[PDB]
RNA sequence: UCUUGGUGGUAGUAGCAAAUAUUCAAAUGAGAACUUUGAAGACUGAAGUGGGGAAAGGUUCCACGUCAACAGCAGUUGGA
RNA sequence: GAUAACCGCAGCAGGUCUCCAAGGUGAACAGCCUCUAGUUGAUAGAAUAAUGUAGAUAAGGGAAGUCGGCAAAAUAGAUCC
RNA sequence: UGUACAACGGGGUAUUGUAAGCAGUAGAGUAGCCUUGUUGUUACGAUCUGCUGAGAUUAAGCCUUUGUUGUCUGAUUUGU
């Protein structure tokens, strides 16, 4: 916890997010969700 | 265990000579066939048959293989044993890929 | 920076220190702008002052009219073509290094800006906003 | 929180991700990575491009 | 764990880019719950 | 043993270099007891010795 | 800053890093990173790390035996 | 006849006269790769801190560095203008 | 002797940019065959098209794993 009570309105800002990116980080990754990835890519020769 | 056995593993040399020095690459892929052989037989003595040489050093110095199928026979050491009665004999497999097998028990019939 | 600019700006890349050879943007007559200063800089030993996109600097007019040439103008830089980050997360930049002339309080000398004009020095510079066309 | 599209390739650019590009004839070009700004730069055809939604579009794979 | 990306409204009246945007890194801290096993008692003395 | 003695003289013999002299190494003992040109000889002739063919220099591509 | 001889500390220390590069087996041996042979990999690339000579050296050539010293690691090898 | 047989205190990256001279690229006895022939000798092994030596790359600016563009980069062959 | 750990394998993620092979009524054309087509033939032919966002690589300091095969008592020292 903040060891003193801090008032500087950079504190006291309700944040609400919009969104969060979850693309790969072990790449520069270019879609959200394997849904996302589907959809953009359509279908693949991997075996179903 | 049981002592005398002959397997087959897959050797992934890629990850094992990944940032390795150039002028390097086949001779510490040949120690890396050892340190191989020394985990899976438990056998410090590792002797590796010239044609698994002509294997690593088939590209030269620096073109080592990303992975090899190597035959590894556990044996009696005879004529003066060692500090260990066991020593592990590595042969190449002449396959068409290296890729997609799992290790296998070779049985001696 | 100084006096004349309406707003605070966001701290943009730096692009451009002394002895920038930068486009004149606007049709006083001058080609070129040689960065010479920037006004708002911090005292450091050893580091070059950089201009950045919006920013006021001292230049000379290297090449263009020989009444503009040989002297000390104020400018202000409308293009960087540094790669600078805007807070809502976009790095962006142009393809050129790109000032206006202007006078001590930000009034331009031209009156028709070449090209895009940064927002960031738009917003910073009314009147560079007023001359300017298309920005960003 | 608008996705934008490469310029060069099709992808779409979530925001954070890659460079603008501001031509000096005032055209925008957005980049999703370097890859596409730096085959921009190399002055490369998308359309011969081969894994470019524009090279797919005109080759007419995946429909 | 690592880092991500968010994107969030700003809520900074007089800021310029107030009602508008912004890209923000943030840690992201895998937390478990902890499991209370002690307590430890503690006077105050001269010494500390 | 220690045959370079008679890789020299076989090299000699069949008129090559020493880089083309190819010797037996399963018949390493009754090599080592060739130390006149004419028991190279005989053991050029039941081929314990072997000339050892010339490396390839092809010139189909240069043609 | 004596002369000659001997010995320390520094100190098992500085170093033994130019000339692309070695590796597997067998043999020999008490003992093999270094010897021999096979195998593979490389290099000099014909103004050569090849084949000969001039000066100089003087037996260094070659074989057999052999490793106390010498080859600034080793040595079963060697211009020892 | 020399990165060990010569001189340099030595088996020293120095120095020391000459002959012969394959294929390709290419103007070329350049550099690069190969054939014949020769060598694979130079203490090694493990790890990959700082500081080095040698080799590099670098956004935006472009000599503002420094006594001084020192070092590096840029240019490069050929054909036509 | 484990909801173990390892080595492989599988999947995901990522990078590059469409592998080899086969086929083609694609190919600037040139050279041969004529019982001369008219989307005849044979030889050579950069490149192109389909199978093919394929193939390759992927932890070496990426993630995951109900798969396969292994591994799991060597040594030394310590007492108020
Ligand atoms: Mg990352
Ligand atoms: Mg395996
Ligand atoms: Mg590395
Ligand atoms: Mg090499
Ligand atoms: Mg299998
Ligand atoms: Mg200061
Ligand atoms: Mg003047
Ligand atoms: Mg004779
Ligand atoms: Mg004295
Ligand atoms: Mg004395
Ligand atoms: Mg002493
Ligand atoms: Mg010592
Ligand atoms: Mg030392
Ligand atoms: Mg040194
Ligand atoms: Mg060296
Ligand atoms: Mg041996
Ligand atoms: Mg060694
Ligand atoms: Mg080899
Ligand atoms: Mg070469
Ligand atoms: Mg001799
Ligand atoms: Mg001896
Ligand atoms: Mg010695
Ligand atoms: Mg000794
Ligand atoms: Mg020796
Ligand atoms: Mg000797
Ligand atoms: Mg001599
Ligand atoms: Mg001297
Ligand atoms: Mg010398
Ligand atoms: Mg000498
Ligand atoms: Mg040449
Ligand atoms: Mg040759
Ligand atoms: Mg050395
Ligand atoms: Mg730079
Ligand atoms: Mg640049
Ligand atoms: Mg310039
Ligand atoms: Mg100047
Ligand atoms: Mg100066
Ligand atoms: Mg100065
Ligand atoms: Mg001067
Ligand atoms: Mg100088
Ligand atoms: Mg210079
Ligand atoms: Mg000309
Ligand atoms: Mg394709
Ligand atoms: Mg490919
Ligand atoms: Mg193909
Ligand atoms: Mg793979
Ligand atoms: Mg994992
Ligand atoms: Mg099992």
């Not at chain 2, 690593?56 to 260990?84: C, M, T």
């Not at chain 3, 070059?48 to 600097?57: E, F, K, N, R």
């Not at chain 6, 076989?10 to 399963?26: F, H, I, Q, T, Y």
């Not at chain 6, 390493?28 to 220099?57: D, F, M, P």
Request: hydrophobic share 40%.
């Amino acid at each position: 916890k903040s060891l003193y009570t801090n008032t500087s309105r950079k504190a006291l800002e309700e944040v609400s997010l919009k969104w969060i990116d979850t693309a790969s980080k072990f790449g520069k990754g270019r879609f959200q969700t394997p849904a996302e990835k589907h959809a953009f890519m359509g279908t693949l020769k991997k075996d179903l | 265990l049981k002592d005398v056995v002959t397997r087959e593993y897959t050797i992934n040399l890629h990850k094992r000579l990944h940032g390795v020095s150039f002028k390097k690459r086949a001779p510490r892929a040949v120690k890396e066939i050892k340190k191989f052989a020394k985990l899976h037989m438990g056998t410090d003595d590792v002797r590796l048959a010239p044609e698994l040489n002509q294997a690593i050093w088939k590209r030269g110095v620096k073109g080592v293989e990303y992975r090899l199928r190597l035959r590894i026979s556990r044996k009696r050491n005879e004529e003066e044993d060692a500090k260990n009665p066991l020593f592990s004999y590595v042969e190449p497999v002449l396959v068409a890929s290296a890729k997609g097998l799992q290790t296998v028990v070779v049985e001696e019939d | 920076s100084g006096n004349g600019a309406q707003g605070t700006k966001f701290r943009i890349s730096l692009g451009l220190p002394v002895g920038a050879i930068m486009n004149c943007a606007d049709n006083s007559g001058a080609r070129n702008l040689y960065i010479i200063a920037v006004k708002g800089s911090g005292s450091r030993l050893n580091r070059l002052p950089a201009a950045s996109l919006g920013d006021m600097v001292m230049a000379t007019v290297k090449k263009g009219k020989p009444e503009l040439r040989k002297k000390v103008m104020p400018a202000i830089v409308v293009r960087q073509a540094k790669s600078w980050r805007r807070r809502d997360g976009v790095f962006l930049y142009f393809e050129d290094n790109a000032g206006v002339i202007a006078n001590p309080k930000g009034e331009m000398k031209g009156s028709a800006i070449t090209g895009p004009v940064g927002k960031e020095c738009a917003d910073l510079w009314p009147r560079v906003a007023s001359n300017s066309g298309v920005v960003v | 929180m608008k996705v934008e599209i490469d310029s060069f390739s099709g992808a779409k650019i979530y925001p954070g991700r890659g460079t603008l590009f501001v031509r000096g004839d005032s055209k925008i070009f957005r980049f999703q990575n370097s890859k596409s700004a730096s085959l921009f730069k190399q002055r490369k055809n998308p359309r011969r491009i081969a894994w470019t939604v524009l090279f797919r579009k005109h080759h007419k794979k995946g429909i | 764990a690592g880092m991500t990306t968010i994107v969030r409204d700003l809520d900074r009246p007089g800021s310029k880019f107030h009602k508008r945007e912004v890209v923000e890194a943030v840690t992201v801290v895998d937390t478990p719950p902890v499991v209370v096993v002690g307590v430890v008692g503690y006077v105050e003395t001269p010494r500390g | 043993a220690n045959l370079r003695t008679q890789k020299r003289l076989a090299a000699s013999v069949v008129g090559v270099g020493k880089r083309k002299v190819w010797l037996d190494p399963n018949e390493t003992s009754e090599i080592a007891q060739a130390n006149s040109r004419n028991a190279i000889r005989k053991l050029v002739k039941n081929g314990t010795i072997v000339k050892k063919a010339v490396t390839v220099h092809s010139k189909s591509r240069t043609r």
